[PDB]
Write a protein that binds this ligand. Structure first.
Ligand SMILES: CCCCN(CCCC)C(=O)c1nn(-c2ccc(C(=O)NS(=O)(=O)c3ccc4ccc(I)cc4c3)cc2C(=O)N2CCc3ccccc3C2)c(C)c1Cl
Length: 135
């Protein structure tokens, strides 16, 4: 599997959900993602209005979130949360007419997967183990 591809398809789909067209594992991830954000809809709504996304704040938001999310370790719930959060930054990017931020966000999600999560993903059955959770 390829992390960059997984990021790109996921971000494409979330944006597509919202009528914005952007320049197996994917299916499982979005199903997980939808159940995750429906369960925490209120929290995602609070978080959205607090984000004050701009090109100046966006790297810092990303790092703050990701650092808080994985501080105690990694599990699949937290990786689903990580995609949902990325989706939220890209949706908000678009809402506020900072669409070029999407490319940064996608790049940051990829670096962080390849760099810092890849190891744990392997020890836990690769992406295949996650698919043998959602079909
Ligand atoms: C987008 C998430 C990061 C946002 N921040 C920081 C806010 C700005 C600083 C967090 O506070 C944070 N969230 N997690 C979680 C991570 C995982 C879960 C979680 O897994 N919950 S679950 O077990 O009920 C669940 C729920 C649905 C699931 C669906 C599919 C699958 I596979 C697994 C699922 C698991 C909950 C949580 C968590 O604590 N919350 C309540 C806080 C919150 C705030 C905004 C959005 C979602 C959430 C979920 C953590 C550790 C942090 Cl720290």
């Amino acid at each position: 599997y390829d992390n960059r591809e997984i990021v790109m398809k996921y971000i494409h789909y979330k944006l597509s959900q919202r009528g914005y067209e952007w320049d197996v594992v994917h299916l499982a991830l979005r199903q997980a993602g939808d159940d995750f954000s429906r369960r925490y809809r209120g929290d995602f709504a609070e978080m959205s209005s607090q984000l004050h996304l701009t090109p100046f704040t966006a790297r810092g938001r990303f790092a703050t979130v990701v650092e808080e999310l994985f501080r105690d370790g990694v599990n699949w719930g937290r990786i689903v949360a990580f995609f949902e959060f990325g989706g939220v930054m890209c949706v908000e990017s678009v809402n506020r007419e900072m669409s070029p931020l999407v490319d940064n966000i996608a790049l940051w999600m990829t670096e962080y997967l390849n760099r810092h999560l890849h190891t744990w993903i392997q020890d836990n059955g690769g992406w295949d183990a996650f698919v043998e959770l959602y079909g």
